[PDB]
mmCIF file with all atom_site columns, C-alpha atoms and ligand atoms in Angstrom:
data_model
loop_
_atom_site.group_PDB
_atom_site.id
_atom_site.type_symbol
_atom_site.label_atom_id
_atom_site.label_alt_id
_atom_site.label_comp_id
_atom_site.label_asym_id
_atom_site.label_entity_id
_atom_site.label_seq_id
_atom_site.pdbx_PDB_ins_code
_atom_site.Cartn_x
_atom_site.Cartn_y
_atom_site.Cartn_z
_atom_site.occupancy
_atom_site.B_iso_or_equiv
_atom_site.pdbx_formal_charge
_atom_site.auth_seq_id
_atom_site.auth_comp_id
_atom_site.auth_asym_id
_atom_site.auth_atom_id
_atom_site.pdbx_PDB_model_num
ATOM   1   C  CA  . UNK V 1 1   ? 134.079 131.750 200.955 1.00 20.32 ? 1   UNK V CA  1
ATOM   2   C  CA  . UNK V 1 2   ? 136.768 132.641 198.556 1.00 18.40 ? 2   UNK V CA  1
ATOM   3   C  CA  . UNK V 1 3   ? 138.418 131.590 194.914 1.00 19.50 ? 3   UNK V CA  1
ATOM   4   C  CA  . UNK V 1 4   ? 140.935 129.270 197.140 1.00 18.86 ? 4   UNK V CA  1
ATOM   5   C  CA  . UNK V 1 5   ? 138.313 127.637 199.199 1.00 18.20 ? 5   UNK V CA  1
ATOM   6   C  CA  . UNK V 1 6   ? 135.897 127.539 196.572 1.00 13.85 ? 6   UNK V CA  1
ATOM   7   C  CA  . UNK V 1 7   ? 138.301 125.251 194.116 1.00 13.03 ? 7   UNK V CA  1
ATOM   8   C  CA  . UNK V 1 8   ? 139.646 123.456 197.309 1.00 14.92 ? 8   UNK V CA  1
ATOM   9   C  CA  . UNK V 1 9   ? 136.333 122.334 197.677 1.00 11.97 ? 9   UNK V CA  1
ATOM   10  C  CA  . UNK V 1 10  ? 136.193 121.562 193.920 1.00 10.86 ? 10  UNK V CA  1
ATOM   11  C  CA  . UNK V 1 11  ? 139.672 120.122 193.596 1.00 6.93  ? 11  UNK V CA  1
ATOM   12  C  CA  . UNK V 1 12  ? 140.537 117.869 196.938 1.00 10.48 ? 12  UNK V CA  1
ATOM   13  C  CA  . UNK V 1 13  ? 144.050 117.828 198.527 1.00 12.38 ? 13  UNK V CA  1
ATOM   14  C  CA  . UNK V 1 14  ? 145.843 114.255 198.082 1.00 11.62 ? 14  UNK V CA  1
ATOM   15  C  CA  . UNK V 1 15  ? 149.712 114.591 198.786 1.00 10.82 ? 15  UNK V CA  1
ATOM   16  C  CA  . UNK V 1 16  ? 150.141 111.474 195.933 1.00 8.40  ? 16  UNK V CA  1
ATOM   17  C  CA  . UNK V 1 17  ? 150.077 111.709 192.184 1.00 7.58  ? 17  UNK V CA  1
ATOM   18  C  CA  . UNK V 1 18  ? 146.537 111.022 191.354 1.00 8.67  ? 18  UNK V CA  1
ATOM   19  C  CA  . UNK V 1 19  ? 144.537 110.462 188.415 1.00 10.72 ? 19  UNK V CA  1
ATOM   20  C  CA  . UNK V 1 20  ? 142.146 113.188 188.074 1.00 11.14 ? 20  UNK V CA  1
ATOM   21  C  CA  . UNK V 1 21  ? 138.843 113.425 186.020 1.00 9.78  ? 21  UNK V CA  1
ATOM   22  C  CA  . UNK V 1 22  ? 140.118 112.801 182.997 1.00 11.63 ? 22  UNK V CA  1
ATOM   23  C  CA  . UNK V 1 23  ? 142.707 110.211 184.002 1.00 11.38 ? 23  UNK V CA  1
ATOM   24  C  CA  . UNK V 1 24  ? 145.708 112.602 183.865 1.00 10.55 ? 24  UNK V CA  1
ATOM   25  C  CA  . UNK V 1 25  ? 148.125 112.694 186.238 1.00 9.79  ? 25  UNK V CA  1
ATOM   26  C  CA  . UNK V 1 26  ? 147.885 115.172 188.743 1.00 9.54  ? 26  UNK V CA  1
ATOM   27  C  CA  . UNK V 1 27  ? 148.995 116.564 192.470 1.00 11.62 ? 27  UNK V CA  1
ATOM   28  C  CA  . UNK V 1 28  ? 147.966 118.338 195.634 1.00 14.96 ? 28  UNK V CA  1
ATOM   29  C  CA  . UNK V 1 29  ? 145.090 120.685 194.991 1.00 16.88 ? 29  UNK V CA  1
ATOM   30  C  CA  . UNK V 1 30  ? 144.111 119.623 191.137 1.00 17.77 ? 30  UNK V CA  1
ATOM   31  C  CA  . UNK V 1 31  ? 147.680 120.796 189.909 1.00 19.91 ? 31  UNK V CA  1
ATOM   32  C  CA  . UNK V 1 32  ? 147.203 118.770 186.748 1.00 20.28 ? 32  UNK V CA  1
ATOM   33  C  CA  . UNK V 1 33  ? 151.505 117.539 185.890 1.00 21.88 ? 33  UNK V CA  1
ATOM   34  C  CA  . UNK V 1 34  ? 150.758 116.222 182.267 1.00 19.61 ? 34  UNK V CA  1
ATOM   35  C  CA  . UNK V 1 35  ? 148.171 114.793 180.114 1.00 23.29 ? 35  UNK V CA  1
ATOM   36  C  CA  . UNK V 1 36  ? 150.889 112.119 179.232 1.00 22.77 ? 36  UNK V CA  1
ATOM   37  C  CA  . UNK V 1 37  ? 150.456 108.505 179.757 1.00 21.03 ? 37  UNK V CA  1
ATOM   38  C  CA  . UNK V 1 38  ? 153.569 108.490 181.507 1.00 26.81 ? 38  UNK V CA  1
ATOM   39  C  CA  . UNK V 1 39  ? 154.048 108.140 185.271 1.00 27.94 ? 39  UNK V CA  1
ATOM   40  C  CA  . UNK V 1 40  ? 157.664 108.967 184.686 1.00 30.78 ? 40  UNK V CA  1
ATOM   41  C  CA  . UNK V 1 41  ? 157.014 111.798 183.111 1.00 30.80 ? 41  UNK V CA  1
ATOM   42  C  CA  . UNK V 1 42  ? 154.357 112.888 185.664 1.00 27.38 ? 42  UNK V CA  1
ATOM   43  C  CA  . UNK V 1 43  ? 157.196 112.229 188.299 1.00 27.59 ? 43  UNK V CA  1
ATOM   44  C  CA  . UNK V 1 44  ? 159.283 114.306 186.120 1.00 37.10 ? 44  UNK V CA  1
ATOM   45  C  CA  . UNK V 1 45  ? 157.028 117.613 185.780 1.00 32.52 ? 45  UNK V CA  1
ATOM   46  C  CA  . UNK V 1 46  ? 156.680 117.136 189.566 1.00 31.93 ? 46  UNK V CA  1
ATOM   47  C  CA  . UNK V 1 47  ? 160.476 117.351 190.405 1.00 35.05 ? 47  UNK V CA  1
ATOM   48  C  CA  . UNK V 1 48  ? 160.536 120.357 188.015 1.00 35.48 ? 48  UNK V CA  1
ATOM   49  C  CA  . UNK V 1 49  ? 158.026 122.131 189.867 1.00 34.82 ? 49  UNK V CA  1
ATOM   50  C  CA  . UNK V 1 50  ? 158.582 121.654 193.408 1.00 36.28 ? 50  UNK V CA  1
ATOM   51  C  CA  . UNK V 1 51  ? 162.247 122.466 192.343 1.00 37.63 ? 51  UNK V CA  1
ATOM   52  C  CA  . UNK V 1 52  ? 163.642 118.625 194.047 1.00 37.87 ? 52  UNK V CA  1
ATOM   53  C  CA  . UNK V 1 53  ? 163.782 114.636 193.291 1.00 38.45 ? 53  UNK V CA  1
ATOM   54  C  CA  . UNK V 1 54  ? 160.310 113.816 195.103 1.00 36.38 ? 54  UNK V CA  1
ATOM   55  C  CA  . UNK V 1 55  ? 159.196 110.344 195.615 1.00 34.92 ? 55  UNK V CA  1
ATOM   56  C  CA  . UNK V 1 56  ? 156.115 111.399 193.612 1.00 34.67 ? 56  UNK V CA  1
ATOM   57  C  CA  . UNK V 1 57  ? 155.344 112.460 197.196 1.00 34.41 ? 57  UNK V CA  1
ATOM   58  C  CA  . UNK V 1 58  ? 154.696 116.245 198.397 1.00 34.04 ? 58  UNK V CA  1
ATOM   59  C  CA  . UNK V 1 59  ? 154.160 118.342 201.677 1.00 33.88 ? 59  UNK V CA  1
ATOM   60  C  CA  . UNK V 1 60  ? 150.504 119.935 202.245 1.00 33.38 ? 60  UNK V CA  1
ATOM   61  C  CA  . UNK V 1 61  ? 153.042 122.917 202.383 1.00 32.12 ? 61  UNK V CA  1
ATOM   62  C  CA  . UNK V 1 62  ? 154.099 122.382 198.806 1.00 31.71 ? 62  UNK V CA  1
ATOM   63  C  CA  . UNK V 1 63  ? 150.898 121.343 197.670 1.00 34.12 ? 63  UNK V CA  1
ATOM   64  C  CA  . UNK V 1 64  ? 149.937 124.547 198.460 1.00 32.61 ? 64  UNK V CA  1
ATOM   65  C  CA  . UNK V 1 65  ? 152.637 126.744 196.959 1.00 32.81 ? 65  UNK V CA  1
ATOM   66  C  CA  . UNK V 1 66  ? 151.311 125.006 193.518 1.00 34.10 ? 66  UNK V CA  1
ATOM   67  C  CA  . UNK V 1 67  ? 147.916 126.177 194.330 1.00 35.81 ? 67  UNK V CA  1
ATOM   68  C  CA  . UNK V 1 68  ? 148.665 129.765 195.038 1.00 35.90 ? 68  UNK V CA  1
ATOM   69  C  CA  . UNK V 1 69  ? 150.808 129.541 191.807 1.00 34.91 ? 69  UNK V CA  1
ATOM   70  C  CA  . UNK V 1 70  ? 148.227 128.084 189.807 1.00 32.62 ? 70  UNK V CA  1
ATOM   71  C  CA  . UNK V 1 71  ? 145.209 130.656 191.169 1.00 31.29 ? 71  UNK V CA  1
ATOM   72  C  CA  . UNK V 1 72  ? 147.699 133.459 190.115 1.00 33.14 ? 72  UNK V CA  1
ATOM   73  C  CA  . UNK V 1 73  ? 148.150 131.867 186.617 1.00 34.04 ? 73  UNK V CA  1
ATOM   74  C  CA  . UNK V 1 74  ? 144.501 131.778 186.107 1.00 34.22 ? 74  UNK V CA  1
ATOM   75  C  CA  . UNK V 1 75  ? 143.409 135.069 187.111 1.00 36.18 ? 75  UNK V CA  1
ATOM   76  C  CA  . UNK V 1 76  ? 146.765 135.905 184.615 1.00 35.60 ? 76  UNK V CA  1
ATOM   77  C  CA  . UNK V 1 77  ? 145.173 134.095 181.694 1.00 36.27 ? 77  UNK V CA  1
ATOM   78  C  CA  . UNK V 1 78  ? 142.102 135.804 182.269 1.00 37.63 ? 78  UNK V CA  1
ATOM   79  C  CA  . UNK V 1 79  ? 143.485 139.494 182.100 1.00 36.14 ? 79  UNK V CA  1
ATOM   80  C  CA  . UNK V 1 80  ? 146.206 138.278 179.439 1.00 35.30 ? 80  UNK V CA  1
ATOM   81  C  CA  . UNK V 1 81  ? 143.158 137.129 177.054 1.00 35.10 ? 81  UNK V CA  1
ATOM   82  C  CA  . UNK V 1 82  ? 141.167 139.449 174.643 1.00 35.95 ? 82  UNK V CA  1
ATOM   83  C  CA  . UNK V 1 83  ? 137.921 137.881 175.293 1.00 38.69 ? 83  UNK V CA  1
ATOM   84  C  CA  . UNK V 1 84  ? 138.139 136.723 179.185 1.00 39.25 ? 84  UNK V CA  1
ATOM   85  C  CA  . UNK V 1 85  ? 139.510 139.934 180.564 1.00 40.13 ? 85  UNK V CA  1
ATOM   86  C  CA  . UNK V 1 86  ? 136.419 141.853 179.457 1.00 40.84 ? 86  UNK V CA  1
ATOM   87  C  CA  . UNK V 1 87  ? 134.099 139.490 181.122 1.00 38.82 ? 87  UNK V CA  1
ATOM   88  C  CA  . UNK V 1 88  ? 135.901 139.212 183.790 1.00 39.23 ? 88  UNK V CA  1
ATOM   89  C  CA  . UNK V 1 89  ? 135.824 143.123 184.622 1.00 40.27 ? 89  UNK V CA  1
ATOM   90  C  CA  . UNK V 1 90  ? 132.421 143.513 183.854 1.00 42.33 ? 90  UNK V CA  1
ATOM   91  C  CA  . UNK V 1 91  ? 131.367 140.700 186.875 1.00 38.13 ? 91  UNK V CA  1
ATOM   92  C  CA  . UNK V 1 92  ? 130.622 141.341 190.247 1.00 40.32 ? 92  UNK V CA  1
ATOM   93  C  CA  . UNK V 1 93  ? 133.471 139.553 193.023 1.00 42.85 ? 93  UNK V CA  1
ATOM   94  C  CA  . UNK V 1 94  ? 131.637 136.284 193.198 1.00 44.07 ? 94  UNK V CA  1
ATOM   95  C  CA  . UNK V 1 95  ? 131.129 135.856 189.872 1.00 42.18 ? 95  UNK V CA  1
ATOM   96  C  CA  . UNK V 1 96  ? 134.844 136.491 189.059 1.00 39.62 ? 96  UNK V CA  1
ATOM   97  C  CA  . UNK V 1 97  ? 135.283 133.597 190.797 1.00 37.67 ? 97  UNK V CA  1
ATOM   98  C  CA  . UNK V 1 98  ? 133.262 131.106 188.728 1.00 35.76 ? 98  UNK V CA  1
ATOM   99  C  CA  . UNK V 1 99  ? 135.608 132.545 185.760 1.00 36.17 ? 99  UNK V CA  1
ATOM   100 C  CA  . UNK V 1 100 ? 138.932 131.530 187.858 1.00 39.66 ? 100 UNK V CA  1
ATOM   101 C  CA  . UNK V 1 101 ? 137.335 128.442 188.496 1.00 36.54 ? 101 UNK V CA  1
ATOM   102 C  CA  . UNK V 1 102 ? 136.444 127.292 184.912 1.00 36.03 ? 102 UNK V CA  1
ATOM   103 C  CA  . UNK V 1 103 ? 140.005 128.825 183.770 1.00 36.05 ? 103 UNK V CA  1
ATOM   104 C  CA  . UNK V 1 104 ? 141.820 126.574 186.282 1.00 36.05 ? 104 UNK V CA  1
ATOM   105 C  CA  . UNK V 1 105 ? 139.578 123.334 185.440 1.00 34.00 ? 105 UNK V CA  1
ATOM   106 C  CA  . UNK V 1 106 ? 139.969 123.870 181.607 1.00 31.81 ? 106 UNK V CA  1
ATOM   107 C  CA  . UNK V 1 107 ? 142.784 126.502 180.763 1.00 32.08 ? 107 UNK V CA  1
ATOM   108 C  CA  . UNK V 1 108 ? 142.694 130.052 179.642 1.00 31.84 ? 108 UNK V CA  1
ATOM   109 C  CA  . UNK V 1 109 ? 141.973 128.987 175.674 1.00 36.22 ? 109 UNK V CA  1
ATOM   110 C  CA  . UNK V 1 110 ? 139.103 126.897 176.577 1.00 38.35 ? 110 UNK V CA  1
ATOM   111 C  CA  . UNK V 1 111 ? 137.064 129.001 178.620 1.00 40.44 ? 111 UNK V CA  1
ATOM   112 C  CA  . UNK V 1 112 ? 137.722 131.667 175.568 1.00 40.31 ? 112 UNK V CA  1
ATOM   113 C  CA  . UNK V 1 113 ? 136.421 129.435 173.179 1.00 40.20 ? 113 UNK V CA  1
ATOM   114 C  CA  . UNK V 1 114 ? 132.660 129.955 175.287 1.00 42.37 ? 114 UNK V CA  1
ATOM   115 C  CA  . UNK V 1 115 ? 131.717 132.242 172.972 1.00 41.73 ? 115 UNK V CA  1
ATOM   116 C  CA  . UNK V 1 116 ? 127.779 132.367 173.370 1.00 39.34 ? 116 UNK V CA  1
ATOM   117 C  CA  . UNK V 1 117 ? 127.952 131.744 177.598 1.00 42.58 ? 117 UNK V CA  1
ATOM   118 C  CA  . UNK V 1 118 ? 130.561 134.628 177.620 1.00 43.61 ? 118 UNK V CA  1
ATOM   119 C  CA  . UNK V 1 119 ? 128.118 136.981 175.987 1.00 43.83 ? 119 UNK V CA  1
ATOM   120 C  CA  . UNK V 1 120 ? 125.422 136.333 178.305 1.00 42.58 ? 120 UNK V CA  1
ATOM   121 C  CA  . UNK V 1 121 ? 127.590 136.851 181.116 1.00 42.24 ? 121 UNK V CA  1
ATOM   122 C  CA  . UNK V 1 122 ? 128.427 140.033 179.597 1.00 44.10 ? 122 UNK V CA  1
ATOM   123 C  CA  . UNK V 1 123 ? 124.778 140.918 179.349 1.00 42.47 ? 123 UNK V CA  1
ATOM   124 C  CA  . UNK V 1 124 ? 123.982 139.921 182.678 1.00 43.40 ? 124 UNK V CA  1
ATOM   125 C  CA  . UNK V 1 125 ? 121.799 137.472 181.131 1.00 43.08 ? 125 UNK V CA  1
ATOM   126 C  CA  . UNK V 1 126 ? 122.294 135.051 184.263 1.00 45.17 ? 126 UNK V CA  1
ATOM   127 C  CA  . UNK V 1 127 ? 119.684 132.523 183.761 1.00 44.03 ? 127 UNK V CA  1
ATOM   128 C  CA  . UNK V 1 128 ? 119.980 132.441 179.959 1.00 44.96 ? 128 UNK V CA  1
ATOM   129 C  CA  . UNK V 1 129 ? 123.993 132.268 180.564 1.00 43.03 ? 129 UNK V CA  1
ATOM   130 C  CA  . UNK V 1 130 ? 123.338 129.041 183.141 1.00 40.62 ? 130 UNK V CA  1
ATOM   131 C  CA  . UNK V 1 131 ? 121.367 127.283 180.775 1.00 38.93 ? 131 UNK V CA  1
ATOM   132 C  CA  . UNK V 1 132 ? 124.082 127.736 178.058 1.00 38.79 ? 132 UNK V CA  1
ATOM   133 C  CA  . UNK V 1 133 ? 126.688 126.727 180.114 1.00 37.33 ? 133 UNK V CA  1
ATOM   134 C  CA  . UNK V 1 134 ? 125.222 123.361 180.929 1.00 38.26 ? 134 UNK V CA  1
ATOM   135 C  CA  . UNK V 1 135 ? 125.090 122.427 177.005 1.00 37.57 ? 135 UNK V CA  1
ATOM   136 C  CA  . UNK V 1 136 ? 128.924 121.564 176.769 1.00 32.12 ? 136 UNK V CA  1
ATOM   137 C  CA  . UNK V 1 137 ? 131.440 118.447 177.341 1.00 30.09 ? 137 UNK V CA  1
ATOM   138 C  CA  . UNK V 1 138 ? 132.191 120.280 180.616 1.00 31.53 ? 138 UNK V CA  1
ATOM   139 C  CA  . UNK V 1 139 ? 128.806 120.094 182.047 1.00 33.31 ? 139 UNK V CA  1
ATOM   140 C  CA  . UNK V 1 140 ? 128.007 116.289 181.113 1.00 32.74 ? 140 UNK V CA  1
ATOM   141 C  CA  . UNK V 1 141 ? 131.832 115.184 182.078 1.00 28.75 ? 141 UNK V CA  1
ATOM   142 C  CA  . UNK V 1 142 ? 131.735 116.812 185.709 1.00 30.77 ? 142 UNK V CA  1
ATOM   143 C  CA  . UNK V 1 143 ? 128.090 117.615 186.592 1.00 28.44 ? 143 UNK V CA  1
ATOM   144 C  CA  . UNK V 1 144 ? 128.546 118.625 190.307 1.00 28.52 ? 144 UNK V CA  1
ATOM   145 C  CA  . UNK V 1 145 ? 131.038 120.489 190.111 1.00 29.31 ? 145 UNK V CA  1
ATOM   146 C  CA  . UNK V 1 146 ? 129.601 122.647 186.827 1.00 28.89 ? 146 UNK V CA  1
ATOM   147 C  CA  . UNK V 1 147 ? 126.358 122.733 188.824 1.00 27.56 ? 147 UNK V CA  1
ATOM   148 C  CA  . UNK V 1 148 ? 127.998 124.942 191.064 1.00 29.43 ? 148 UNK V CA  1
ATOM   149 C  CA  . UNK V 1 149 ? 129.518 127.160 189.205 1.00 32.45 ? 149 UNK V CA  1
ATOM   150 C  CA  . UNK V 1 150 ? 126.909 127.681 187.419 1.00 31.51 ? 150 UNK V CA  1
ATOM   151 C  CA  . UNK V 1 151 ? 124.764 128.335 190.632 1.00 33.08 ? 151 UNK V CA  1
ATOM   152 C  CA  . UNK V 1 152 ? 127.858 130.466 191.206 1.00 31.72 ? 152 UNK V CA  1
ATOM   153 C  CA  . UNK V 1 153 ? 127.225 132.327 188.009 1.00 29.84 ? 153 UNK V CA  1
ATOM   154 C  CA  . UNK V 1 154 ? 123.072 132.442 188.093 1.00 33.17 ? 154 UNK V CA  1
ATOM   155 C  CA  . UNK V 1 155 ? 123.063 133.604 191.806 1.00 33.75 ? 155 UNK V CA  1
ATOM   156 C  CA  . UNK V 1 156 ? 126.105 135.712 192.399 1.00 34.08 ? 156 UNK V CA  1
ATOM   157 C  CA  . UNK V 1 157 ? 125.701 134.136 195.860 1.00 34.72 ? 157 UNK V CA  1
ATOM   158 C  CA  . UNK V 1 158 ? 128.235 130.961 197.328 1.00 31.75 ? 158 UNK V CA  1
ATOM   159 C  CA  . UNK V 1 159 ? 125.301 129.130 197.875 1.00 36.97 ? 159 UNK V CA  1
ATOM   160 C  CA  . UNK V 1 160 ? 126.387 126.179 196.284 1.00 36.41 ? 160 UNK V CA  1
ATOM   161 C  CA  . UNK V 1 161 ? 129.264 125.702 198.652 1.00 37.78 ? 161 UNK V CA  1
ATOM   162 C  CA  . UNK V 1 162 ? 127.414 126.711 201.744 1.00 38.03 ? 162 UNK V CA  1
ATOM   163 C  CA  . UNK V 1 163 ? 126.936 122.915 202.825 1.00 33.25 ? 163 UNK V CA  1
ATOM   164 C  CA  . UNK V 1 164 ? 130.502 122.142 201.306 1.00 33.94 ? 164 UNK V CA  1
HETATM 165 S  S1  . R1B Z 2 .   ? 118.813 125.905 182.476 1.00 33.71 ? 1   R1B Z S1  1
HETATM 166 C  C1  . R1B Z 2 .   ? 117.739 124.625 181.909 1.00 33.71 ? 1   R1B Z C1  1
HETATM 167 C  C2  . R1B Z 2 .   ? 116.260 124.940 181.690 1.00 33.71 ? 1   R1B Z C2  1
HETATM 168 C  C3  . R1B Z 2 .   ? 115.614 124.538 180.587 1.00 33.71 ? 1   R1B Z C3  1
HETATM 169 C  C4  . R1B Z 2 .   ? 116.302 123.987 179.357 1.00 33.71 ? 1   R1B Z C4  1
HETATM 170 C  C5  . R1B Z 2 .   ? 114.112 124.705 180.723 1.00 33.71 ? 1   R1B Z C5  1
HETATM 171 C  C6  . R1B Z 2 .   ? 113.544 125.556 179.589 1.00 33.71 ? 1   R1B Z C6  1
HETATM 172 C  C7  . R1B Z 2 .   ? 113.430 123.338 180.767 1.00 33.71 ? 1   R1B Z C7  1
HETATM 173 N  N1  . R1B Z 2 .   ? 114.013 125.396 182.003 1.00 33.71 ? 1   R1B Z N1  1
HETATM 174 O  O1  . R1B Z 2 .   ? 112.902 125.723 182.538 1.00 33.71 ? 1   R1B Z O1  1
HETATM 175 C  C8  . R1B Z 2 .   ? 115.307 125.682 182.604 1.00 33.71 ? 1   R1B Z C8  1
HETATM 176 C  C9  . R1B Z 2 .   ? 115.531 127.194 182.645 1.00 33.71 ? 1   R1B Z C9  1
HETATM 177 C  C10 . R1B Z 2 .   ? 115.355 125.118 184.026 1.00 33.71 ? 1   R1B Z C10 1
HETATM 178 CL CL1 . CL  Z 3 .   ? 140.935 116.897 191.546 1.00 36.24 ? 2   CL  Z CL1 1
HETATM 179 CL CL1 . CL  Z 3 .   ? 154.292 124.474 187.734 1.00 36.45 ? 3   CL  Z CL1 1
HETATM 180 CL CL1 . CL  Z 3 .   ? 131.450 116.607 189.207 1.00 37.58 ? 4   CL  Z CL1 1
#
């Protein structure tokens, strides 16, 4: 296991604009396009990103080269960000990789704004940070998928994707 098969399992691959969780628009392996209404301007972001006029249609290929993309820019956001980066280099490997994960699900601000969970984390608190975590919009919206990351962040271990 690994931060890209970790949020493959987490994200799914479908080649289609999509609808994700929270009905927005989105592409290959959860590369959200737009939280706009607008198919034609999902269509649009895609074009812009795969750099040609797609048939809101992509290669596994491409699909891909978003995903590698969008790993890097959340590991960026974490190091770029006064109160990620810290928690971030005081976690063990596997842990690190529950942060990714919540910074590519949310964004870089959101996962900042975990104030209380963060500090736990810092402290190594790892039950006490679990509990915390699951008291948020983020938990109650997408339950499985916090569940694990949250097993991710109590255990240090990928047992939660073990059977995945
Ligand atoms: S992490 C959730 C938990 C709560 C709120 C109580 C106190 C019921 N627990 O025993 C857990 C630690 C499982
Ligand atoms: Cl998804
Ligand atoms: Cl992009
Ligand atoms: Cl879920």
């Amino acid at each position: 296991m690994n931060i890209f098969e970790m949020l493959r399992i987490d994200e799914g691959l479908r080649l289609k604009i999509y609808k994700d969780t929270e009905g927005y628009y989105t592409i290959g392996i959860g590369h959200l396009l737009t939280k706009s209404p607008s198919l034609n301007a999902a269509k649009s972001e895609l074009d812009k990103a795969i750099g040609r006029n797609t048939n809101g249609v992509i290669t596994k290929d491409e699909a891909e080269k978003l995903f590698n993309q969008d790993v890097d820019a959340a590991v960026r956001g974490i190091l770029r960000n006064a109160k990620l980066k810290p928690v971030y280099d005081s976690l063990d490997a596997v842990r690190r990789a529950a942060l990714i994960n919540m910074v590519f699900q949310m964004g870089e601000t959101g996962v900042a704004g975990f104030t209380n969970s963060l500090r736990m984390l810092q402290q190594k608190r790892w039950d006490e940070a679990a509990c915390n975590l699951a008291k948020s919009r983020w938990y109650n919206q997408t339950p499985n998928r916090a569940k694990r990351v949250i097993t991710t962040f109590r255990t240090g271990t990928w047992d939660a994707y073990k059977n995945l």
